[PDB]
Design a protein around this ligand. Sequence first.
Ligand SMILES: CC(C)C[C@H](N)C(=O)NS(=O)(=O)OC[C@H]1O[C@@H](n2cnc3c(N)ncnc32)[C@H](O)[C@@H]1O
Ligand SMILES: CC(C)C[C@H](N)C(=O)O
Length: 1004
Amino acid sequence: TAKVDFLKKIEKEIQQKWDTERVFEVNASNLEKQTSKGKYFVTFPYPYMNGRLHLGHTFSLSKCEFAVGYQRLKGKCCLFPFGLHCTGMPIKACADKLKREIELYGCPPDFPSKYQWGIMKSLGLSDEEIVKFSEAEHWLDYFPPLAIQDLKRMGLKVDWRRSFITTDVNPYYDSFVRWQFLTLRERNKIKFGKRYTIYSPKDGQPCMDHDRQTGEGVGPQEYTLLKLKVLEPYPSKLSGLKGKNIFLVAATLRPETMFGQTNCWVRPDMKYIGFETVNGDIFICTQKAARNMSYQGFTKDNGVVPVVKELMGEEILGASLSAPLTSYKVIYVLPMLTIKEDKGTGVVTSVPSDSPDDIAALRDLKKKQALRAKYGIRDDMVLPFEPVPVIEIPGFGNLSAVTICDELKIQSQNDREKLAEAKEKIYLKGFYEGIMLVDGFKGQKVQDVKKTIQKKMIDAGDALIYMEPEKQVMSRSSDECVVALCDQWYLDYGEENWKKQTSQCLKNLETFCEETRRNFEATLGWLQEHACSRTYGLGTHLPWDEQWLIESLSDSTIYMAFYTVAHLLQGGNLHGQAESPLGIRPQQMTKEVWDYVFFKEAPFPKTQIAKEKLDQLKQEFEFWYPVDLRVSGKDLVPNHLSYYLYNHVAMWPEQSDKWPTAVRANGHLLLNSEKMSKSTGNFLTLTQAIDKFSADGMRLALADAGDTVEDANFVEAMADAGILRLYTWVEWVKEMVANWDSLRSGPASTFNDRVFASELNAGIIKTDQNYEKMMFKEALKTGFFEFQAAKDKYRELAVEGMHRELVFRFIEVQTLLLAPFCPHLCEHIWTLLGKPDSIMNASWPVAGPVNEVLIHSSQYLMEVTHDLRLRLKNYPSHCTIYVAKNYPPWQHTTLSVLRKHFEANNGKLPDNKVIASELGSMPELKKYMKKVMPFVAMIKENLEKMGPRILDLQLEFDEKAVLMENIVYLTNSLELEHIEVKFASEAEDKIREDCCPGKPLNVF
Ligand SMILES: CC(C)C[C@H](N)C(=O)NS(=O)(=O)OC[C@H]1O[C@@H](n2cnc3c(N)ncnc32)[C@H](O)[C@@H]1O
Ligand SMILES: CC(C)C[C@H](N)C(=O)O
């Protein structure tokens, strides 16, 4: 239980030595006279500053910590910088929950954990310090220094000096941002206009992906909205807007179908509003509908619902309606008991002919009289209205809905699953196949005339556009967002000649699997304009309409260029207030200066900055770009990373090269197979993990988390079997330096040594491939779990004791396979082996030629040892083992025949049917067609397990002799007395006939 502490200690001292010799500070002025193999540059999406760093953070970024640990050995020079996001809508939303909690309940509060106060005392804060966190700017004081201490404490390979904060509190970053956005307005990628977006009324601004708590992908979804005029007489409750004209307002998606209205659906129990539009009319719907319309300019005042009256639907029942389009000049409001209150307007269009719900429920009101009677509806309001043909889908004729409803045997509006199957297999056809019937459009496929039917209804004033968030959107601040129609500066991602270009960048980008790339391709063709113009929350100010601020997904996109110069500008002061190393004033970074630094061919600008500094920066940036690698969750694919090509494409539109190169999406970290939830008692800040399991102890489990795009897992129990094998290895290397002698002076020629060194070399290679494929689970598997396999194997098979020079080799090479993973343990180990330098300077271990047939021989060996420890738990002293020289007769036939079926079609043995068929057809297998089809099966098994080598008429290595090279170990672990190995020709009938090479038999 104190072995964990054995790890923590050497960590703290190794970290001390590291940043006092400043091992991780790289400069590009130094490393441009010496091209290693090039540069290596990785970034992590700088995280939000509304908290310590949690674990899911650390697993998403482990990925680049290991990339550079590895690529530094491989010899590249590493730049791993770290920025800190605050330009958020997160930091302020939190500060405001805390503000309104202090002011509702006191300091110390008193409530009727789950309140933000209780989360802030969960960080050990005195009372009067949690109070100072109410305006957002105490966060920018507090959390960034904590991220930098939490990162140096995990031991990451990071140039402090290039780090920074992101709101206008940091001047330099702000000047950078303004430069970007001047160039963007300049090149016609930022526009202004009245557009649609998701929008939070409490926020007073657009609510885009990173400002949300729910529905991070949703956007505006359109509807047609129909006006139904209520006709005199009004029902008993519409009485006092004696003046105005009164409208039922209903949401639909199939405007072409509106010819077949027979009525109108409301739910007797639902709460409906009536309110005064902009032109003095009374619209009737749900409060949520109205609020959505208000923000889209339906109301006199934006977002204010002038509520004229309130009521359940039950009072509306029986109102007469003039409806658009339908040749029923008078229809009625009827009760549909099952209306979802979320989507739409609480009023639905009854097209019995093409919605199944509708023909169902209309049947129901016709069917039994008490369904009318309870809602007091007259019969003239229901019975005289039969369904109506408008779409003729080919499969089904005029009346598609009622047709497919009578064949699924429907009887009420609640058979909801049968109904929904119907709506699938009718609606989707209706779009493509369907063909219109009504005059004018007599016979066009609806896919075409849908839009123009709709326009026709708008201009005769009968219908209006209505938007709605698709699935619901929560905001950070907890206000249920709506679409709004508003003034906005925005990014023009729907342009043709920009989407073209960035999707080219996508083709050239490297995603590490096919699915991550289909996500990019998905959102590219989906992405249109993106509203970046905000008005509340921390950040940076739009330099020409300064009431606007830049939202977080839009000032985040090309930030990595700055990462290359921060150390020469802020020098590492996070707020950049400390003077600049280069001496350059923030007030001196005008566009033309940035322009110079970044665009290769810009002109030196009329600036007071001596030419040498500007060259230092231009140089640095040009050395480190492009971005070699960005790492992240599967979540930033549909927003930040799409916007990240798009922007790089538009910034250096010319340099194909300055674009990003590669991008690797892991999933969301789980905890012990559990959604990692602060409420479920199932959670771990990094500050916390690093003291529970050592930082090496942690990183180890974080390699084994996952490399699927699919959500990876973190199991604490395995973090512990990890601290285990680490302390046994360190005690093991203590053990080997203490016994330099009871190892073997002289030549390492024994059979097992060749085997073990050819194995250690195959491990160095598999680990190299797994590191460069960035599969840190398998890089672990090969590089360590099996390195220890092959070490213990040669611990056991070497009865002669193990060879000194080979031991210290394995020590070094293991320790180097591990450095990217646990650099503190390895640093300790490497100074144990007394080497003079820091292990960060080591070259990747070189691999020696790999003896294949050897390793097959030792595999064969090990396998029959397993087999014979099995057959032994039964009943002895003597053993005798038999091994057949040639395959027996029936088997050299069945395997000269699987040789012929393998040789004739590039390796595809036909099915079980062609094989057993042509083996019953050879007479020499008649007594043995009971043993001729298990055998081929076992063959196909290993023909799928260790190569086609099992199809040779003769092995690659003397069986009998390989046996004989290791027999001592066998009698000693098997604890017998003597074992004969006869060549299976002197054995009995059963043994000489059922024994094949590769699977010997034996007796006691
Ligand atoms: C650049 C700007 C637009 C973004 C801003 N800096 C920001 O998003 N900060 S953050 O706090 O949510 O993102 C930090 C990183 O960590 C990854 N990640 C997050 N959660 C998890 C998780 N549960 N499991 C695994 N990985 C996670 C995530 O992909 C992201 O790259
Ligand atoms: C009854 C419905 C099919 C009417 C409209 N097309 C909708 O989907 O809401």
